[PDB]
């Protein structure tokens, strides 16, 4: 049995991003952790974590026994900084080498780790709505969905991860997936283009009422990502013949599912445009829409028109060292 206990009163200290780390009901002293890297991706690759812990006395691996299968209780938040959010999650340890009186811990989120396990036996869902499939595959997450229309058939073979079927569902429905902070998310691509922004990020403006960007990267390679999606889909249906979908002046490519709705959404994605580095905002999660204003720092203060007004967040990386808390994001536009 597992008992839910109250937090202890001996933890009087407040930190920047990483608040406390515990193994069961025992606490690793926080001053011993010198690194932290938390990554929230924009697809079903799950949140990741990496901790660098200074261990000169041989205590973390020797006496605590940290190896494959150790469950960490990590409290992450920022109740005083730019974004006052606070949450708790559980992580599953994959490996932890020890070098130079230091230990590097590689961890994966437990609810997604359970989704990244190869299947011992095959499961087939015949003529089931997508909601039942999602609930049966991942019965531990809350479902946030708005783009489920029809019913279809899905197959999960032996040795395949359950994440493959979820990604196939996303492709067939035309939505964006990411599992973070106890939820699994399906959000349509057509409705994302018409969403109002929530935050404002400005550059070269010191009288701004929003936040500030310190470094940013402009990507002009839009063909690099559109090259793979420039095809005309075709497939065989036993009662209709050959079914086409897409443009008329592109090369042909064959798939297997002869479903017009699934064929229509086969070529939808998000095109990355910009990478930026800010001063540690913990409210930045994938799916967020921001307003970006960039001024030039020489010549005559001309605005840069090559950066669109509204952008969507795709990937977020938070990083804390022993002195500073930083965030990095990748922004994109719906095709």
């Amino acid at each position: 049995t597992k008992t839910t206990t109250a937090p202890e009163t001996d933890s009087k200290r407040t930190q920047l991003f990483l608040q406390s780390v515990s193994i069961g009901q025992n606490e690793i002293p926080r001053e011993m952790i010198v690194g932290c890297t938390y990554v929230e991706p924009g697809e079903l690759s799950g949140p990741q974590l990496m901790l660098m812990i200074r261990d000169s006395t041989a205590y973390v691996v020797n006496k605590l026994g940290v190896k494959f299968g150790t469950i960490l209780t990590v409290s992450l938040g920022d109740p005083e900084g730019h974004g006052g959010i606070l949450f708790s999650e559980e992580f599953f340890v994959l490996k932890a080498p020890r070098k130079d009186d230091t230990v590097l811990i590689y961890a994966f989120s437990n609810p997604v780790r359970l989704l990244k396990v190869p299947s011992t036996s095959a499961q087939y869902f015949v003529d089931k709505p997508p909601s039942a499939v999602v609930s049966s595959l991942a019965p531990g997450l809350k479902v946030n969905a708005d783009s489920f229309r029809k019913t279809s058939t899905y197959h999960l073979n032996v040795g395949e991860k359950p994440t493959k079927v979820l990604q196939e569902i996303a492709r067939d429905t035309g939505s964006m997936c990411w599992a973070s902070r106890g939820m699994i998310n399906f959000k349509s691509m057509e409705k994302m283009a018409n969403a109002a922004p929530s935050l404002t990020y400005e550059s070269a403006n010191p009288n701004t009422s929003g936040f500030t960007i310190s470094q940013f990267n402009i990507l002009n390679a839009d063909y690099e990502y559109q090259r793979r999606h420039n095809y005309r889909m075709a497939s065989y249906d036993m009662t209709k013949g050959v079914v086409y979908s897409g443009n008329q002046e592109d090369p042909i490519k064959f798939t297997s599912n002869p479903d017009p709705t699934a064929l229509a959404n086969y070529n939808k994605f998000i095109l990355p445009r910009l990478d930026m580095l800010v001063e540690g905002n913990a409210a930045l999660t994938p799916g967020t829409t921001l307003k970006i204003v960039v001024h030039n720092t020489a010549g005559d203060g001309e605005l840069d028109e090559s950066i669109p007004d509204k952008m969507i967040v795709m990937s977020v990386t938070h990083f804390e060292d022993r002195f500073r808390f930083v965030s990095r994001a990748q922004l994109g536009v719906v095709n």
Binding site: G81, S203, T212, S214, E279, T297
Partner: protein, 177 residues
Amino acid sequence: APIAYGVYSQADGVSPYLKVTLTNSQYQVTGYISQGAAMNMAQNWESMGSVSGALGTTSVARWNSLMVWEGGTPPTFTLPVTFIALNNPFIEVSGAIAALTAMISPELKAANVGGQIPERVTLNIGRRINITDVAIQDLSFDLDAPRDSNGYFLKNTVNLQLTGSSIYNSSDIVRAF
């Protein structure tokens, strides 16, 4: 019981306020203060910031508009001790140098791991500044000092560098005085 050396006795007429003693579990060395002693401390205050991301919540999260703290150092000392013989040259000038040379070295033949590390000393400058767990880092002395008819030094001078073993808090460092 440690073994005494140096100018520990009071036959010369110098007050204890003008002498430095280094004490550990084996030796005890006493000497005078020369003209160039000092005590030092430092802190590090600051790249990743840019002009376009400045402004005209705590003060620690805003590293692009305010200064940030990175770290500091334990207090350091530079003590050029001095010895002069008056009654017995061996226990005053030629023994103190050997004692310091023994205190600076490790002991690799001991059974425990903690006994092999060079040991730490207690520094007491005069009678009013006392610091514990001080690690000896450098040492030096000259070889052209005047000699006795038996071959032992009648005077010498040793230059030392000492460091603390941890960063001190504001409340703790006041107690050292």
